[PDB]
Symmetry: C4
Subunit: 246 residues, 4 copies
């Protein structure tokens, strides 16, 4: 039935979660992170604003492929961190391990720039996303992740509602970034929980999948809704259900 079509996004959710755990492991074999303070989400957010400000001044300052380059470089590096973490727990400190990861990341990034197969895109998007998920999740603990999640969710629903209301007014009364990015969002709580086969934080994983269910449901219905609050609110739901478990 409606299996093969549009299961790929919950697929991507589960996968990213999986790869985030498996990456929880090697990334501490060389540290990484960035104190389970509730101020940590605030630093996160402001810094996110800086990430965008930089990115925008870069785009408006392009840079026909200078923009492509600066991001290409950013990519190259983040993949170095991915791979790096892999071999460095794997073959460990060996020259053949490190060089293994540099060649790996060169290969991958070059590929992505060479008009790949663009199922490939989904795959790398999954990699990257899992990477980030693992990092902040390894970085500090739930209650802070929980605050962060609920905050970001609130911003979102404000954002959709504003522009939706702005649709309903104006008569008479690159998407992948936001996407895969939100693929990441509920998963970071999944890491920073197994960081605090798996726990009762499978619960967070399933609840996040169920949030995604409500989401692709309303999206496959007429007259869309917000996003984060289904995914985060559902991951938090599952997670808190996995407390009522043990």
């Amino acid at each position: 039935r409606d299996w093969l079509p549009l299961l790929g996004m919950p697929l991507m959710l589960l996968f990213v979660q999986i790869i985030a755990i498996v990456l929880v492991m090697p990334m501490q074999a060389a540290g990484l992170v960035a104190p389970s303070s509730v101020a940590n989400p605030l630093i996160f957010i402001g810094m996110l604003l800086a990430f965008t400000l930089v990115l925008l001044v870069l785009l408006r300052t392009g840079g026909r492929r200078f923009i492509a380059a600066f991001i290409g470089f950013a990519l190259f590096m983040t993949f170095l961190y991915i791979f790096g973490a892999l071999s460095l727990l794997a073959l460990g400190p060996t020259t053949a391990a490190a060089a293994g990861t540099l060649i790996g990341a060169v290969a991958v990034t070059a590929l992505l720039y060479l008009y790949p197969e663009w199922y490939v895109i989904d795959i790398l998007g999954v990699l990257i996303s899992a990477g980030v998920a693992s990092i902040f999740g390894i970085s500090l603990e739930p209650l802070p992740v929980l605050v962060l999640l609920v905050l970001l969710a609130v911003y979102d629903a404000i954002s959709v509602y504003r522009t939706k209301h702005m649709i309903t007014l104006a008569e008479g009364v690159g998407a992948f970034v936001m996407g895969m990015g939100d693929l990441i969002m509920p998963s970071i709580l999944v890491v920073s929980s197994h960081v605090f086969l798996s726990a009762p934080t499978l619960g967070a994983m399933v609840g996040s999948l169920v949030g995604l269910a409500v989401l692709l449901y309303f999206v496959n219905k007429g007259n869309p809704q917000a996003g984060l609050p289904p995914l985060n609110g559902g991951a938090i739901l599952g997670f808190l259900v996995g407390a009522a478990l043990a």
Copy 2:
């Protein structure tokens, strides 16, 4: 009826500016007396704005929209959080209580208000800023800061008025700004040595500001002419010196 309204707005900000002073010094800390403090202050504002605008000229759609929302949220954190949870207080479920409070408010402010809501919130924030600086030091750097600021206003008004005799948001910002300016002599003189019906010379300043704004609103309806700050700013100054020459 709003003819009482805008003085009310002031009176309230002043009251709420004082109430926050106690819990405000549960940390507080911005800027000794030192009159270089007003200068550092000015340059801080000018550089702040210059940066803030280049954020617009480099922004500022969903960016500076959100960016302001964030700054707003933080400032509301300090207001709710620090000023009420320490006023409980302090910690634990109270602190969480105010996170809930400030997210509730900034989210509410965003989206669409209803008259009084925005007035209330502006008043609150204003009281916050007022309290902080009035605390962050004494009534003499404040006296100078005030006369400086006011004199700038009257002059830019005349220049740009005289710059006429030829031939939305920044408004609420500047409004709030005027709600703030006299309140600092009120907090910072409360940081001074008398105490009648709770600090007499600070009362003097307070009424002096309420009458200053009155005179301004009269001339505002007289037509065009109003040197912005110099009524209430300079007049609350007059009132303060009046309530101080008493004790």
Copy 3:
């Protein structure tokens, strides 16, 4: 004869020099400055580039009277330094001295903003200029000032020649800032010389006046020339003549 007309600019030269000396005095009674290194001119120049970059991003970001304000504030402060230095050597550390200078500078700056008498402008321009002259001149020593002067002069002649040649090509083959600023330029060597009634650095003062003579001469002739090299080259000429003296 041609006295009263266009002697006012050499007038302004002598005056600024005079006021720069008289200010050499009080400004050390509270220090100021900024090492007689030849790297000092380079720091100067780069920093000058920063002064302009700031000023330009400010103008292009105006600021109808925000621009007016930011500069008004800058002015207010530099006059505080002028006056401040005055009373603080004068009445010294007294409250009445300091408050004297704040009221003084408020008065002056407010005046300048109130459409003054605009001979007044020349006068304040003279004040300011002398102020700056005194500061860098008190700051470090001749050979560095000498390098700085010759450098700046070279930039200038390049600049005029470029745009002049650009005039001669395009057929078929606020001024006060640059002005009073150059009023300042040769005088800083006049300070940093009496800092290293006056010396044989009267020589630098007269030679600078004579440079100005060549300058207002060619300017009052058809087909203009560069500027700095007459003024600086002439001040340096007089100065080096005041070495062949003692």
Copy 4:
């Protein structure tokens, strides 16, 4: 005749890049081997440029005109000054001598040249940058930096070439840049352990770069296709490994 000219330009830059190495380490100092050095390097370039352009978008008339003139003057100071006065040397009238030298040159470069003048100067500067980095560390971070940089080029060429198969200043800059790229394996392998006709494997790299650029110029006249860096960059790399497998 310039058919020999552009290889000459390279050959010279390489020579002049080496000559400067000795006096260059009379201070020098930019960036241990460490391959993070190439990464730090890239990010340095990207952030450098991004800033440099926002200087244009915020400039850049008489500003960035002069600003470049200044940067140029400084870099010429280090070339003349440090590389010749310490090579005298060092100090006193020699140092002054080079101030005179570099002001003379940058002023000369500004205003209008004449063919060879700009070529000469570009070559000089290039040798400077080449020398510094080749010194600022060893032939392995350099190997990686090189293959990274080159691979980026071939890919942006194909993308923007393939971005075609639908339907002035930066040129000299990028040119100079290519004059630079292979010379760093030449300096930095001279910073390595053989010494025939003065460092044999560094010779190998050097000829390998001279033939690489040759192959590039052949295809450039073959029509359109030239993956910028990968000929000489990747080829000088081949040559270096060839002259190294010798001793």
